[PDB]
Design a protein around this ligand. Structure first.
Ligand SMILES: CNC(=O)CC[C@H](C[C@H](N)C(=O)O)C(=O)O
Ligand SMILES: [Cl-]
Ligand SMILES: [K+]
Ligand SMILES: [K+]
Length: 254
């Protein structure tokens, strides 16, 4: 009956500061695919919300003692009711929080400058001249850390010995690919957005795995089921496809 606390972080084109001459405040500060999604869920389900940026700016991972951070920790501590963001649904996380059914499907792939004609992950793993890494404390990093696939094991070994291989966020990571001989391990629908706008960057290879984004909730949340059905209904009508086209719609690359 109360407004729901929504945790998030800034990530183009999912959650961004809207442009204005005015100083903005409250929910009005934000726009993007997840905000559009949040509005539709709120309309369909009849709830209100207050959006808050997660203080540590992280999605969430476990430390050596097994303690979480990021939005995942916000849910665990019940400081937020929902995590509305491009939050990857993973089995390791389902151990701490719950998820709606996925609202978007994606996979891990490679972002790299057009040039050295690498064609796959295997090529990166067998060398060190081209450094590579991932966003710290995100799903992609954790995927590598936990993998039993020989190649990805080789990659994690490399990433974790190399001090700045793992970057604070996408913005930092993308910049590194543009200024250093560096490849970023990143999620594919994001790679898609970036390579349409940065014509010297490209995706290398295809998708190495396949997973989903979902809305996070505290374990046992009373909103989770209701969110899932609304999401399912949005997909049936191709609305999430249309919504994506809206925010990915950009000026192409020769
Ligand atoms: C769409 N957001 C990003 O690419 C930022 C980092 C992401 C965050 C990831 N979806 C996660 O849930 O931890 C990643 O680790 O690949
Ligand atoms: Cl905030
Ligand atoms: K402003
Ligand atoms: K209300």
């Amino acid at each position: 009956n109360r407004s729901l606390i929504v945790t998030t972080l800034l990530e183009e084109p999912f959650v961004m500061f809207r442009k204005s001459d005015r100083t903005l405040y409250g929910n009005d500060r934000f726009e993007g695919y997840c905000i559009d999604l949040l509005k539709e869920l709120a309309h369909i389900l009849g709830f209100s919300y207050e959006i808050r940026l997660v203080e540590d700016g992280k999605y969430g991972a476990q430390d050596d003692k097994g303690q979480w951070n990021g939005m995942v920790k916000e849910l665990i501590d019940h400081k937020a009711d929902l995590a509305v963001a491009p939050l990857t649904i993973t089995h390791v996380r389902e151990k701490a929080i719950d998820f709606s059914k996925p609202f978007m499907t994606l996979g891990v792939s490679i972002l790299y400058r057009k040039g050295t004609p690498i064609d796959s992950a295997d090529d990166l793993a067998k060398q060190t001249k081209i450094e590579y890494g991932a966003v710290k404390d995100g799903a992609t990093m954790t995927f590598f850390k936990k993998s039993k696939i020989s190649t990805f094991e080789k990659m994690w070994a490399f990433m974790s010995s190399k001090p700045s291989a793992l970057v604070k966020n996408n913005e930092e990571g993308i910049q590194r690919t543009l200024t250093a001989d560096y490849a970023l391990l990143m999620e594919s629908t994001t790679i898609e957005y970036i390579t349409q706008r940065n014509c010297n960057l490209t995706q290398i290879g295809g998708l190495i795995d396949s997973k989903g984004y979902g809305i996070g909730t505290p374990m046992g949340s009373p909103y989770r089921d209701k969110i899932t059905i609304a999401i399912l209904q949005l997909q049936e009508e191709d609305k999430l496809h249309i919504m994506k086209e809206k925010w990915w719609r950009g000026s192409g690359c020769p």
